Amino acid sequence: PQSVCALRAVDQSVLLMKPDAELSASSVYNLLPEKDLTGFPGPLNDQDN
Amino acid sequence: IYVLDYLNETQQLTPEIKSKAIGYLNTGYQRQLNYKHYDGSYSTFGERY
Numbered sequence: 466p467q468s469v470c471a472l473r474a475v476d477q478s479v480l481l482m483k484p485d486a487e488l489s490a491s492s493v494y495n496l497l498p499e500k501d502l503t504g505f506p507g508p509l510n511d512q513d514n
Numbered sequence: 515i516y517v518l519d520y521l522n523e524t525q526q527l528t529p530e531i532k533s534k535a536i537g538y539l540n541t542g543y544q545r546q547l548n549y550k551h552y553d554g555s556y557s558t559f560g561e562r563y
């Protein structure tokens with residue numbers, strides 16, 4: 466209800482001619498750092514007993 | 515190196531003997547860096563094993 470928007474309307478002749486650049490929710494998702502956290506990183510090795 | 519400070523502190527030295535072992539110093543410093551581990555820990559043989 467209290468939000469702010471980005472509003473594009475284009476002719477689909479430039480754009481049929483060539484696509485836009487990789488826009489979706491997925492784009493945001495795979496733009497992300499460490500989708501998963503699986504395995505520790507490298508520098509840290511372990512804790513022994 | 516603890517001697518290097520003895521030459522320095524007791525004031526019996528010269529830049530040459532200074533420079534002489536500086537050449538020694540960086541080597542064994544580096545030669546050691548082939549003997550240690552990727553965890554940062556150090557071994558007697560280490561690498562190639």
Ligand SMILES: *[C@@H]1O[C@H](CO)[C@@H](O[C@@H]2O[C@H](CO)[C@@H](O[C@@H]3O[C@H](CO)[C@@H](O)[C@H](O)[C@@H]3O)[C@H](O)[C@H]2NC(C)=O)[C@H](O)[C@H]1NC(C)=O
Nearest residue numbers: 515516517518519520521522523524525526527528529532
């Ligand atoms: C090993 O070598 C150094 C190199 O000269 C020996 O001289 C010491 O050098 C330090 C440099 O910081 C001297 O400190 C001085 O402090 C005064 C006052 O703040 C400042 O005006 C100078 O610019 C300088 O920074 C120091 O006095 C001098 N000897 C000492 C520590 O009594 C040093 O003797 C040897 N010791 C080491 C570095 O293991």
